[PDB]
Amino acid sequence: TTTYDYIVVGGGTSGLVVANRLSENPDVSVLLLEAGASVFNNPDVTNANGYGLAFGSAIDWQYQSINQSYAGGKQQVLRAGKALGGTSTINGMAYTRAEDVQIDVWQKLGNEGWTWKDLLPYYLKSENLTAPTSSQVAAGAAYNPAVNGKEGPLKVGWSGSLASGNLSVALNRTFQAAGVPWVEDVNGGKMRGFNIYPSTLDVDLNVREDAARAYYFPYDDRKNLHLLENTTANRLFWKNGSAEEAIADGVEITSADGKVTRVHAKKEVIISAGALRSPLILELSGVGNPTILKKNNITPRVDLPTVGENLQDQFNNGMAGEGYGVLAGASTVTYPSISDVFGNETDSIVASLRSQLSDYAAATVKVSNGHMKQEDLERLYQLQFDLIVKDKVPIAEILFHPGGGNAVSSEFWGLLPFARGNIHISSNDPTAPAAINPNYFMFEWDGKSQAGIAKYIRKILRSAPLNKLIAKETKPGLSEIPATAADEKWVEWLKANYRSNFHPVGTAAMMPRSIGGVVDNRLRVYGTSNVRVVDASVLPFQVCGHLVSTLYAVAERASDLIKEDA
Ligand X SMILES: Cc1cc2nc3c(=O)[nH]c(=O)nc-3n(C[C@H](O)[C@H](O)[C@H](O)COP(=O)(O)OP(=O)(O)OC[C@H]3O[C@@H](n4cnc5c(N)ncnc54)[C@H](O)[C@@H]3O)c2cc1C
Ligand Y SMILES: OC[C@H]1OC=C[C@@H](O)[C@@H]1O
Known binding residues are 13-14, 34, 61, 87, 91-92, 94, 233, 536, 548
The number of residues that bind ligand X (CB under 6 A) is 39
* 503 is an active site residue: yes
- What is the CA 217 to chain-centroid distance, rounded? 24
Least separation in angstroms between CB 273 and ligand X: 4
- Give the residue from 498, 455, 206 showing the smallest Cα distance to 336: 455
Q: Which lies closer to ligand X via its Cβ, residue 60 or residue 376?
A: 60
Tell me the C-alpha distance between 125 and 557, whole Å: 9
- Please name the amino acid found at residue 424: H
Q: Is 198 in the site for ligand X (CB under 6 A)?
A: no
- Please name the amino acid found at residue 510: M
Q: Is 311 in the site for ligand X (CB under 6 A)?
A: no
Tell me the C-alpha distance between 129 and 419, whole Å: 35
Least separation in angstroms between CB 445 and ligand Y: 4
Asked if 435 and 296 touch (Cβ cutoff 8 Å), the reply is: no
Contacts of 325 (CB under 8 A, 6+ apart): 406, 469
Q: 28 contacts which partner out of ligand X, ligand Y, none, CB within 5 to 8 A by kind?
A: ligand Y
Q: Which lies closer to ligand Y via its Cβ, residue 84 or residue 453?
A: 453
Least separation in angstroms between CB 15 and ligand X: 6
Q: Is 7 in the site for ligand X (CB under 6 A)?
A: no
Interface with ligand X by CB under 6 A: which range of 163-171, 471-479, 482-490, 540-548?
540-548
Q: Which lies closer to ligand Y via its Cβ, residue 267 or residue 277?
A: 267
Q: Using CA atoms in the order 136, 139, 145, 146, what is the torsion angle rounded to 10 degrees?
A: -160
Asked if 430 and 284 touch (Cβ cutoff 8 Å), the reply is: yes
From the list 226, 264, 401, 503, the catalytic residue is: 503
Least separation in angstroms between CB 335 and ligand X: 14
Exposure letters 523-559 (e unless 16+ CB within 10 A, then b): bbbbbbebbbbbbbbbbbbbbbbbbbbbbbbbbbbbb
- Please name the amino acid found at residue 315: F
Tell me the C-alpha distance between 245 and 527, whole Å: 5
Sequence ranges of the binding site for FAD:
13-14, 34, 61, 87, 91-92, 94, 233, 536, 548
Least separation in angstroms between CB 447 and ligand Y: 8
From the list 371, 401, 424, 546, the catalytic residue is: 546
CA-atom Rg of the chain in angstroms = 23
CA distances, 346 to each of 240, 340, 392 (Å): 58, 9, 11
Least separation in angstroms between CB 429 and ligand Y: 30
- Give the residue from 33, 502, 36, 539 showing the smallest Cα distance to 281: 33
Interface with ligand X by CB under 6 A: which range of 139-147, 447-455, 518-526, 545-553?
545-553
Q: Is 533 in the site for ligand X (CB under 6 A)?
A: no
Q: Which lies closer to ligand X via its Cβ, residue 480 or residue 560?
A: 560
Positions touching ligand Y (CB under 6 A) are 22, 24-25, 28, 92, 94, 316, 349, 352-353, 356, 399, 411, 444-445, 448-449, 452, 501-502, 546, 562-563, 566
Q: 563 contacts which partner out of ligand X, ligand Y, none, CB within 5 to 8 A by kind?
A: ligand Y
Tell me the C-alpha distance between 354 and 510, whole Å: 26
* 546 is an active site residue: yes
Q: 22 contacts which partner out of ligand Y, ligand X, none, CB within 5 to 8 A by kind?
A: ligand Y
Interface with ligand X by CB under 6 A: which residues? 9-15, 33-36, 79-83, 86-88, 90-94, 232-233, 272-275, 277, 502, 535-536, 546-549, 551
